[PDB]
Amino acid sequence: SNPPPPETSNPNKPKRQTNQLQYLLRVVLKTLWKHQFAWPFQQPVDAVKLNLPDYYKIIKTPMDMGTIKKRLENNYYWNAQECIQDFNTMFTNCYIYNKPGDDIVLMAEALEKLFLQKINELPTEE
Ligand SMILES: CN1C[C@@H](c2ccc(S(=O)(=O)N3CCCCC3)cc2)CC1=O
């Protein structure tokens, strides 16, 4: 079976609004979400529907952009680095589970190159 998705809200986790987190939602996530390669990454890997029975035997820290989007919308993150770490987990999982040269890996690599450009332009904390 699929595991439960990663937590996207938590009543005990403190909250704040920052210009860097707003940039991650309004610029970084927005750009990646609408990219033509985004769709396999817009929700948790459904190993049942995709017929990937070993996926969660190999990947123990799943992550996807649907989860990241909810975390940003729900004010789950305290700082930008927590969000950046989640994007990197998503990319790394893809590179670990799949083989170099697979189309899904090429898609992830393209999304990551775009992501790193946008993070290079992260605004300073106000
Ligand atoms: C992040 N993920 C998602 C999982 C997934 C696998 C295959 C398909 S696919 O067969 O639809 N297709 C493959 C070729 C490139 C476009 C998508 C979708 C999702 C695997 C993975 O590491």
UniProtKB/Swiss-Prot annotation:
Record disease entry: Cornelia de Lange syndrome 6: A form of Cornelia de Lange syndrome, a clinically heterogeneous developmental disorder associated with malformations affecting multiple systems. It is characterized by facial dysmorphisms, abnormal hands and feet, growth delay, cognitive retardation, hirsutism, gastroesophageal dysfunction and cardiac, ophthalmologic and genitourinary anomalies. CDLS6 inheritance is autosomal dominant. A chromosomal aberration involving BRD4 is found in a rare, aggressive, and lethal carcinoma arising in midline organs of young people. Translocation t(15;19)(q14;p13) with NUTM1 which produces a BRD4-NUTM1 fusion protein.
Location of cross-link Glycyl lysine isopeptide (Lys-Gly) (interchain with G-Cter in SUMO2): K57
Protein name, per record: Bromodomain-containing protein 4
Assembly with partners or alone: Interacts with p53/TP53; the interaction is direct. Interacts (via CTD region) with CDK9 and CCNT1, acting as an associated component of P-TEFb complex. Interacts with RELA (when acetylated at 'Lys-310'). Interacts (via NET domain) with NSD3, CHD4, BICRA and ATAD5. The interaction with BICRA bridges BRD4 to the GBAF complex. Interacts (via NET domain) with JMJD6 (via JmjC and N-terminal domains); the interaction is stronger in presence of ssRNA and recruits JMJD6 on distal enhancers. Interacts with NSD3. Interacts with NIPBL. (Microbial infection) Interacts with bovine papillomavirus type 1 regulatory protein E2. This interactions may serve for the tethering of viral genomes to host mitotic chromosomes allowing successful partitioning of the viral genome during cell division.
Free-text comment about domains: The NET domain mediates interaction with a number of chromatin proteins involved in transcription regulation (NSD3, JMJD6, CHD4, GLTSCR1 and ATAD5).
Tissue expression per record: Ubiquitously expressed.
Assigned protein family: Belongs to the BET family.
Modification after translation: Phosphorylation by CK2 disrupt the intramolecular binding between the bromo domain 2 and the NPS region and promotes binding between the NPS and the BID regions, leading to activate the protein and promote binding to acetylated histones. In absence of phosphorylation, BRD4 does not localize to p53/TP53 target gene promoters, phosphorylation promoting recruitment to p53/TP53 target promoters.
Function: Chromatin reader protein that recognizes and binds acetylated histones and plays a key role in transmission of epigenetic memory across cell divisions and transcription regulation. Remains associated with acetylated chromatin throughout the entire cell cycle and provides epigenetic memory for postmitotic G1 gene transcription by preserving acetylated chromatin status and maintaining high-order chromatin structure. During interphase, plays a key role in regulating the transcription of signal-inducible genes by associating with the P-TEFb complex and recruiting it to promoters.
Any further remark recorded for this protein: JQ1, a thieno-triazolo-1,4-diazepine derivative, and I-BET, a benzodiazepine derivative, have been tested on tumors with success. Treatment with GSK1210151A (I-BET151, a I-BET derivative) has strong effets on mixed lineage leukemia and promotes myeloid differentiation and leukemia stem-cell depletion.
Compartment(s): Nucleus; Chromosome
Annotated site residues (Acetylated histone binding) in this chain: N98
Residues passing through the membrane, by range: none
Domain Bromo: 16-122
